[PDB]
Design a protein around this ligand. Structure first.
Ligand code: CLA
Ligand code: CLA
Ligand code: CLA
Ligand code: CLA
Ligand code: CLA
Ligand code: CLA
Ligand code: CLA
Ligand code: CLA
Ligand SMILES: CC1=C(/C=C/C(C)=C/C=C/C(C)=C/C=C/C=C(C)/C=C/C=C(C)/C=C/C2=C(C)CCCC2(C)C)C(C)(C)CCC1
Ligand SMILES: CC1=C(/C=C/C(C)=C/C=C/C(C)=C/C=C/C=C(C)/C=C/C=C(C)/C=C/C2=C(C)CCCC2(C)C)C(C)(C)CCC1
Ligand SMILES: CC1=C(C/C=C(\C)CCC[C@H](C)CCC[C@H](C)CCCC(C)C)C(=O)c2ccccc2C1=O
Lengths: 141, 30, 73, 80, 90, 742, 42, 144
């Protein structure tokens, strides 16, 4: 799938709180989650309190990926809404984060490369004495 | 004599401050 | 204190304290270089054990020496 | 970043992928099981160490293993 | 009703000074010149640190050594006659 | 409208559900696979909100449980009355209350425990009781044992009636949901009917029965010569001889010339010199006034008729400067869930219990109660502990509600959202206040200890070197002492003798009450109390507010209310649930209550209690060493713990020996608790594996495979053992000291 | 009757009955023979 | 911005509070740090002189105040040390200022030079000089 863009999406109606962004967002990174709602309704923010999502496209800024994924999974489970989130850097780079292939990870998709596979039982790992004085680890072999 | 009156303040106060400053500077150095 | 109370409570408290330090005026000019976090599990267990042992040894040494030297008999 | 490894005893029940809170694991086609799929952990750098994937795994011993390793801002769960 | 702009990130991430002021200095030029000329030697950092450490140590040692017994009860020493031990020990 | 709605035979009574354990939950009802099943069967027994989702069944179960609890309480009261009637020396104590110790229990003679039958007095041997029941019976006018037997029989009958009522209201006619959701009628009936009418009837009893009998007793008449209580009702001549106002009958009451009843309805205040207690006429007057007030206040809410107030209208139509629209959807929240009501009632009951303990120790309402020190100490400590436990439970139920019954979509409240939107500032400010208070309060004591240990008694914070006096409390005391002179012309004297100013009251050669001085030590102990209370409040509030979610864990509400952790990741997430916060706040409640009771005991023994000779000098139990020895930790350890523990450790071979045994046993239990607080589950599971192998070798393997306790179960066991051991130690020490020395 | 008998056979009820009987027998034995430190029948 | 971890309250955002805080020497961006540090040190030393002479170990003798004054001066020295190291571990020799660049309105403004090696060095020197001067002035005014 080709990554999308989020040029000028508006934001939900919130009154403000103390659970928002901090110095890390200005210094290190933050995250942006965008979705589409068919009607105006009230949802619960991960940072505390309740907000109202405008009908149409909605955009939100958060601090960590866990909050974004929790909000997205709540939206999918309760409202049946498609969502996607990116990560934003101080220099202006925007990196597409949620589904990279265009399909959800729980669904098998052809053309996916396998990482971290060991073709043996968990009890076939070598003893730590065999890998001593080397930079490798037993489970890495 | 009167060596303790000169040596106890030195070990108790000045040397810990010098050591703390040196260790803090060495730790914070990149 | 280190032997019953565990990490999550103190981590949330540290987060709240960090927010409080960041938001206040005349003290946000000073900023830390290492992010403050709560102690680990094994580290807290070790600290509690060290405190327990030090208290044990000091208390018994004081009691024994004082009791044996008060009478000298 | 912690280390997540997958072994060949997996039966492709997709519980670990659903349990992950940071979208670390996904599913790929495979050949040596009835379900014809197997899990993988590409986005290793986003792991926090909650070990929910190990909590949800039916096997004699877990086919997904998490080993704690060098910590960073992401793995420490810091938002400040 | 927008809060995210990619062109600049200072407003998006909230990089402001709440109470900063850019007004000109209110201090009198003559007093400023006097303080600038008289406080110059302490501007250097390493020299200031070395001077502070050495001066503090020397002053503390000199005050401790030169102090008399009136201020410090430890320097006055005992006055009452000594006492015997429990079992008659000296 | 208001109506009676019931359902006929919702459930059928049978023993088929008794045979199969755990029928309420399907997972439990499936069967035992391991031993953990058993530990679950008792944990989820009373969680009615998890068995089903309909409110009707939960309400019916709650009603039946209330009826069963009432039956149990009635059985306990009947047992107490029967013990007072049969095995007691009440009749001997009645004639000479000062020189006889109450006793209502007799021990058998099987093993050698007959040494526990001490010489209480009055030709009796038994265990001295500290429940204060004898004073209650004397104040009620009871002068025989047949009346106590009749009261016990009535209690048994009422307990049976309560049990039958519970069965009837669960299995025969169960009220519908709309019956429980009618709060206006319930409030009207609880205010006007339960409280006003009961107090009015008690005032009538006091006017007709208690006052004449107590007057005859105070005159000096033998208890066997006093006329029976119904003789006063039957014979108006006797009452006319006692109180002439009764000769006029009830005519003055309707004539509005109520002054004629001034003989037995007075406003003097103070303590009665003969018995060292409050006047009974004042008590009857207070009960009458309270009855009038409650009867008037019970007609405020609109039920079934035009006149009245609506609670929802009152809440919604509220406008204020700081509040605003505010309380709009609180009515639905309060009338929807049981947990919010439970938390509110628990907190209110705890506060009321603490206030009750304070008011009871300050102004003794029963005759011959101030001069019995053990009863006073036991009542104070017991009520303080009960109040603390209730206050702790309130926060746990509030957290339970916030976790499992809060949704901002269907039922939204503005105030709760506003509070939840700025929790960080609240937590930070509370943390700073706790740190500051603790630093100052404990640094004062540490500075005093260090200055005294270095031979510098002139640098301490004491009444002689550096004085920190409670000026505001002294001003309040002076105002209260001067109150009846000008501010309250109706009262002859002040309400209590505690206020600085007045005279000393002593009964039978023992001090009853005298003004209590205030100094630096009171200042320090009060600040310590404030510090401990603030820390407990901080812990409970942090537990309640961060229950749904947190910066570390953004989805804590999905895991539930009782979960051990989230995992070894994020650096460690042990003890993140609100249950862990309650389990942690229990310790601080225990600490605070222990400090409070220690302060009360030492101050009362040092500055108030004592004895008086014929000349007029007063000798206190500890000789007034509180003001100079309680300013350092060493003084607290030596002059209180070491000095006052002589009686408990030397009680072997006497009638108090049992107490001494408890003083050891509790200690053991305390240490036992540590085993459950310092270790983990994996070690025990790995040991049980080898034990199970050793069992398997000999063909004695059980089908239910043994399993180590869960983490939450281990924490609960540890905290329970800790609290039980500490409380039992304090109980044994206090009772032994106050019985051997007082 | 079947369900009542099944309930009466549950573990806590049987345990309390057994322990009450044992305690009563021990108490009665200690009452009939007050003190005992050694076995004197032989 | 409702999504920033800060709230707007009458105390935190009022014209009086804003003016009073912006007129404090620690927030004057245009002024060079030495003149601000001098005032800060003067005020801090003048305040610090008191408690040492009022609650010192020798507070009852004739030497008391003098001794207390000396103690106050010593504290200033320690504080100066606590400043110097804080510079060395924070600001490098060639890096620019790290202060915020734009104001609350959005206008671009020159960043403060206090968050720089030379700026912090000037601030510490001025603080030391002002603290010593304030301690001396307080002692002279109190016991002459
Ligand atoms: C390890 C050795 C050590 C030593 C030798 C001292 C020595 C002293 N202590 Mg300190 N102290 C220590 C550790 C030590 N302390 C620790 C661990 C603690 C924490 C509990 C304290 C907490 C403490 C308190 C709470 C107090 C002292 C005070 C004192 C002074 C008591 C003498 C006197 O009666 O006043 C004589 C009169 C004086 C005021 C002396 C004035 C001159 C001093 C020495 C300053 C010289 C200035 C110089 C620039 C110092 C900075 C240089 C830097 C390198 C240290 C003396 C300077 C007392 C004090 O200083 O009063 C405020 C006092 O109140 N100490
Ligand atoms: C925790 C509280 C505590 C407190 C309040 C005190 C207090 C005191 N101690 Mg003790 N002490 C303590 C604990 C404490 N101690 C502990 C734990 C130990 C170790 C065992 C000692 C050991 C000790 C020693 C060894 C000595 C003392 C002595 C003294 C006195 C010396 C005071 C001084 O010189 O410095 C005061 C210095 C200051 C800079 C004051 C700072 C506080 C200011 C006023 C802040 C107020 C804030 C303000 C409201 C801000 C608002 C801002 C707004 C305007 C915008 C003082 C009465 C000394 C003595 O001899 O006294 C008779 C002494 O020699 N103490
Ligand atoms: C090996 C362990 C050792 C230990 C634990 C101590 C411990 C102590 N020394 Mg001793 N001392 C030692 C070896 C040791 N000394 C040696 C090898 C020498 C010969 C240089 C001295 C000469 C000495 C002097 C001249 C004085 C002490 C003093 C003290 C006391 C205060 C600490 C101090 O002022 O540091 C002083 C530390 C040294 C001079 C550094 C020696 C390290 C090596 C070369 C303390 C009891 C003081 C005292 O007597 O107080 C009552 C003091 O005035 N010590
Ligand atoms: C609140 C609960 C309560 C409690 C804790 C007690 C406690 C006690 N009762 Mg009381 N009792 C109660 C209510 C209570 N009673 C009621 C409601 C009645 C009316 C039926 C009685 C009537 C009663 C009698 C008639 C006797 C006691 C006796 C006893 C003692 C021995 C019991 C025994 O060994 O049974 C053995 C256990 C089983 C049969 C099983 C014990 C101190 C006995 C006593 O003290 O003798 C010296 C005794 O004789 N009780
Ligand atoms: C004026 C009559 C009246 C009275 C006296 C009471 C009294 C009481 N109610 Mg309330 N209640 C009333 C009206 C009344 N209610 C109405 C109209 C409603 C419906 C809106 C309720 C709804 C209600 C609920 C849902 C519950 C109570 C409970 C209670 C008990 C509280 C326990 C306690 O505090 O110990 C005080 C102890 C005593 C005084 C015991 C004395 C026994 C009393 C006098 C029984 C007679 C009361 C009854 C209303 C009259 C019988 C009618 C029937 C024969 C036809 C107490 C018995 C709670 C309870 O404990 O449940 C059992 C409870 O859960 N009430
Ligand atoms: C006013 C009455 C009251 C009521 C009706 C409830 C009701 C409820 N509570 Mg709350 N609670 C209260 C007060 C109350 N609570 C107080 C005062 C506290 C503070 C301690 C708590 C703290 C609390 C916690 C921490 C929890 C609840 C939970 C629950 C629910 C489960 C009940 C359960 O299963 O226990 C059935 C009974 C037991 C498990 C017995 C345990 C054994 C006890 C602890 C031993 C006491 C021993 C005895 C005093 C000493 C003698 C020893 C001798 C036996 C040898 C239930 C809805 C539980 C829940 O899951 O909610 C959803 C839960 O986790 N409550
Ligand atoms: C007696 C030992 C003990 C002590 C001292 C503490 C101390 C503290 N507890 Mg812990 N705790 C303990 C046991 C103990 N706990 C146990 C058994 C448990 C059960 C698991 C807990 C569980 C617990 C909880 C759940 C909480 C705390 C919190 C706190 C803090 C309260 C704030 C405050 O008062 O700080 C002021 C400081 C003190 C009272 C400590 C003593 C300091 C004295 C005055 C010495 C200072 C001298 C000087 C500065 C030393 C310098 C010398 C050096 C230079 C050589 C404080 C750090 C609360 C918290 O952190 O919130 C703020 C909190 O929420 N504790
Ligand atoms: C500041 C608080 C205060 C409080 C709590 C009280 C409280 C009380 N006053 Mg006092 N009083 C006060 C100030 C106060 N007074 C002042 C300032 C004055 C001067 C006008 C009086 C003059 C006063 C009179 C004239 C009477 C009372 C009476 C009463 C009592 C009955 C209240 C009632 O009427 O219903 C009650 C103890 C009544 C009384 O003493 O009856 C027992 C009564 O007759 N008060
Ligand atoms: C102790 C006890 C008991 C007992 C109890 C009793 C004995 C009770 C009683 C009670 C009673 C005995 C009550 C009564 C009441 C009454 C009332 C409540 C009344 C009322 C009245 C009225 C209201 C009136 C009115 C009027 C008027 C105002 C005028 C004219 C007309 C008329 C008359 C109508 C028992 C065993 C159970 C249990 C245990 C404990
Ligand atoms: C605190 C407590 C307690 C106590 C309690 C008590 C003591 C109670 C009481 C109560 C009471 C004391 C009650 C009462 C009630 C009453 C009533 C309920 C009444 C009624 C009445 C009526 C109904 C009447 C009627 C009539 C008549 C008859 C005549 C005229 C007409 C009329 C109709 C009016 C105890 C220890 C348990 C413990 C826990 C807690
Ligand atoms: C001691 C301990 C154990 C072991 C404790 C166990 C196994 C409890 C054992 C309870 C009883 C004694 C077992 C037997 C119960 C049956 C009713 C026995 C029936 C036979 C006769 C006695 C009637 C844990 O499992 C544990 C888990 C987590 C943290 C701390 C700890 C911990 O400290």
């Amino acid at each position: 799938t080709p990554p999308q863009l989020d040029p000028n999406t508006p934001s939900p109606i919130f009154a403000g709180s103390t659970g928002g962004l901090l110095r890390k967002a200005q210094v290190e990174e933050f995250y942006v989650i965008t979705w589409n709602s068919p009607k105006e309704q009230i949802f619960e923010m991960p940072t505390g309190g309740a907000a109202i999502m405008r009908e149409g496209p909605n955009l939100l800024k958060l601090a960590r990926k866990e909050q974004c994924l929790a909000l997205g999974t709540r939206l999918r489970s309760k409202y049946k809404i498609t969502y996607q989130f990116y990560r934003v850097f101080p220099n202006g780079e925007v990196q597409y984060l949620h589904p990279k292939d265009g399909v959800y990870p729980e669904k098998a998709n052809p053309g996916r490369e396998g990482v971290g596979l060991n073709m043996r039982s968990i009890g076939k790992n070598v003893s730590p004495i065999e890998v001593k004085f080397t930079g490798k680890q037993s489970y890495d072999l | 004599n009167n060596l303790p009156s000169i040596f106890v303040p030195l070990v108790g106060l000045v040397f810990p401050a010098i050591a703390m400053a040196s260790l803090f500077l060495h730790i914070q150095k990149n | 204190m280190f032997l019953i109370s565990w990490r999550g409570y103190w981590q949330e408290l540290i987060e709240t304290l960090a927010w409080a330090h960041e938001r206040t005026p005349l003290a946000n000019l000073i900023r830390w270089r290492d992010k403050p976090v709560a102690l680990s599990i094994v580290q807290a267990r070790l600290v509690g054990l060290a405190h327990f042992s030090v208290g044990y040894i000091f208390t018994y040494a004081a009691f024994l020496i004082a009791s044996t030297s008060g009478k000298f008999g | 970043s912690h280390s997540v490894k997958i072994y060949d005893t997996c039966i492709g029940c997709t519980q670990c992928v659903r349990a992950c809170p940071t979208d670390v694991l996904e599913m790929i086609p495979w050949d040596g099981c009835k379900a014809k799929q197997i899990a993988s952990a590409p986005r290793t750098e986003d792991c926090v160490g909650c070990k929910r994937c190990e909590s949800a795994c039916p096997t004699d011993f877990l086919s997904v293993r998490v080993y704690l390793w060098h910590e960073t801002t992401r793995s420490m769960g810091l938002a400040y | 009703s927008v809060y995210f702009d990619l062109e600049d990130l200072g407003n998006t991430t909230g990089q402001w000074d709440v109470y900063g002021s850019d007004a000109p200095s209110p201090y009198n030029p003559l007093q400023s010149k006097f303080f600038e000329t008289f406080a110059a030697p302490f501007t250097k950092r390493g020299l200031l640190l070395k001077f502070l450490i050495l001066g503090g140590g020397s002053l503390l040692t000199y005050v401790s050594a030169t102090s008399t017994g009136e201020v410090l009860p430890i320097k006055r020493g005992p006055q009452e006659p000594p006492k015997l031990g429990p079992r008659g020990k000296l | 409208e208001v109506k009676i709605l019931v359902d006929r035979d919702p459930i059928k009574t049978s023993f088929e559900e008794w045979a199969k354990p755990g029928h309420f939950s399907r997972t439990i009802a499936k069967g035992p696979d391991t031993t953990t099943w058993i530990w679950n069967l008792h944990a989820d027994a009373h969680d009615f909100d998890s068995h089903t989702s309909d409110l009707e069944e939960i309400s019916r179960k709650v009603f039946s449980a209330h009826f069963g609890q009432l039956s149990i309480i009635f059985l306990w009261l009947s047992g107490m009355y029967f013990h007072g009637a049969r095995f007691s020396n009440y009749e001997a104590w009645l004639s000479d209350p000062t020189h006889i110790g109450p006793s209502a229990q007799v021990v058998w003679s099987i093993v050698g425990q007959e040494i526990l039958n001490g010489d209480v007095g009055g030709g009796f041997r038994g265990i001295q009781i500290t429940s204060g029941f004898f004073q209650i019976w004397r104040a009620s006018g009871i002068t025989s044992e047949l009346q106590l037997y009749c009261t016990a029989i009535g209690g048994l009958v009422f307990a049976a009636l309560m049990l039958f009522a519970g069965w009837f209201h669960y299995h025969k006619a169960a009220p519908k949901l709309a019956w429980f959701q009618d709060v206006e009628s319930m409030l009207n009936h609880h205010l006007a009917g339960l409280l006003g009418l009961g107090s009015l009837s008690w005032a009538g009893h006091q006017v007709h029965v208690s006052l004449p009998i107590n007057q005859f007793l105070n005159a000096g008449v033998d208890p066997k010569e006093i006329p029976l209580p119904h003789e006063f009702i039957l014979n108006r001549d006797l009452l006319a001889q006692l109180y002439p106002s009764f000769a006029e009958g009830a005519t003055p009451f309707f004539t509005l010339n109520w002054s004629k009843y001034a003989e037995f309805l007075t406003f003097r205040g103070g303590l009665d010199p003969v018995t060292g207690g409050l006047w009974l006429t004042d008590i009857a007057h207070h009960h009458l006034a309270i009855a009038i007030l409650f009867l008037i206040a019970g007609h405020m809410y609109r039920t079934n008729w035009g006149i009245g107030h609506g609670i929802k209208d009152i809440l919604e139509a509220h406008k204020g400067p700081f509040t605003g629209q505010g309380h709009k959807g609180l009515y639905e929240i309060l009338t929807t869930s049981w947990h919010a009501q439970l938390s509110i009632n628990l907190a209110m009951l705890g506060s009321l219990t603490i206030v009750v303990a304070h008011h009871m120790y300050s102004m003794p309402p029963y005759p011959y109660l101030a001069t019995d020190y053990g009863t006073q100490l036991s009542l104070f400590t017991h009520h303080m502990w009960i109040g603390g436990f209730l206050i702790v439970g309130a926060a746990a139920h509030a957290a339970i509600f916030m976790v499992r019954d809060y949704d901002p979509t269907t039922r939204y409240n503005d105030l709760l959202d506003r509070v939840l939107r700025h929790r960080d500032a609240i937590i930070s400010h509370l943390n700073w206040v706790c740190i500051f208070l603790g630093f100052h309060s404990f640094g004062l004591y540490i500075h005093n200890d260090t200055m005294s240990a270095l031979g510098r008694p002139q640098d301490m914070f004491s009444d002689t070197a550096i004085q920190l006096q409670p000026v505001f409390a002294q001003w309040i005391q002076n105002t209260h002492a001067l109150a009846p002179g000008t501010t309250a012309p109706g009262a002859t004297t002040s309400t209590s003798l505690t206020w600085g100013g007045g005279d000393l009251v002593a009964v039978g050669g023992k001090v009853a009450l005298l003004p209590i001085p205030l100094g630096t030590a009171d200042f320090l102990v009060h600040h310590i109390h404030a510090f401990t209370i603030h820390v407990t409040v901080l812990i409970l509030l942090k537990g309640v507010l961060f229950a749904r979610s947190s910066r570390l864990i953004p989805d804590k509400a999905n895991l539930g209310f009782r979960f051990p952790c989230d995992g070894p990741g994020r650096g460690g997430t042990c003890q993140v649930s609100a249950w862990d916060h309650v389990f942690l706040g229990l310790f601080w409640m225990y600490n605070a209550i222990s400090v409070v009771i220690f302060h009360f005991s030492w101050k009362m023994q040092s500055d108030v209690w004592g004895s008086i000779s014929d000349q007029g000098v007063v000798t206190h139990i500890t000789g007034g060493n509180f003001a100079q020895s309680s300013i350092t930790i060493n003084g607290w350890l030596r002059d209180f713990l070491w000095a006052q523990a002589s009686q408990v450790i030397q009680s072997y071979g006497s009638s108090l020996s049992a107490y001494g045994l408890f003083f050891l046993g509790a200690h053991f239990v305390w240490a036992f608790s540590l085993m459950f607080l310092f270790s983990g589950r994996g070690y025990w599971q790995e040991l049980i594996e080898s034990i199970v192998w050793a069992h398997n070798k000999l063909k004695v393997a059980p089908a239910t495979q043994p399993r180590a306790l869960s983490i939450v179960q281990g924490r609960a066991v540890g905290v329970t053992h800790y609290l039980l051991g500490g409380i039992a130690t304090t109980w044994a020490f206090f009772l032994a000291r106050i019985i051997a020395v007082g | 009757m079947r369900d009542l008998k099944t309930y009466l056979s549950v573990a806590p009820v049987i345990s309390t009955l057994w322990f009450a009987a044992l305690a009563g027998l021990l108490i009665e034995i200690n009452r009939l023979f007050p003190d005992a430190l050694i076995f004197p029948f032989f | 911005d409702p999504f920033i971890g800060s709230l707007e309250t009458p105390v935190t955002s009022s014209p009086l509070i804003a003016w009073y805080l912006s007129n404090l020497p620690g927030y004057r961006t245009a002024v060079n740090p030495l003149l601000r540090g001098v005032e800060v040190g003067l005020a801090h030393g003048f305040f610090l002189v008191g408690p040492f002479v009022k609650a010192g170990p020798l507070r009852n003798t004739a030497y008391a105040g003098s001794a207390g004054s000396l103690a106050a001066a010593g504290l200033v020295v320690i504080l100066s040390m606590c400043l110097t190291i804080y510079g060395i571990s924070s600001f490098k020799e060639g890096e620019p200022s790290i202060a915020p660049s734009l104001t609350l309105t959005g206008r671009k403004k020159q960043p403060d030079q206090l968050q720089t090696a030379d700026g912090w060095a000037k601030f510490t020197g001025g603080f030391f000089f002002g603290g010593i001067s304030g301690v001396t002035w307080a002692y002279f005014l109190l016991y002459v």
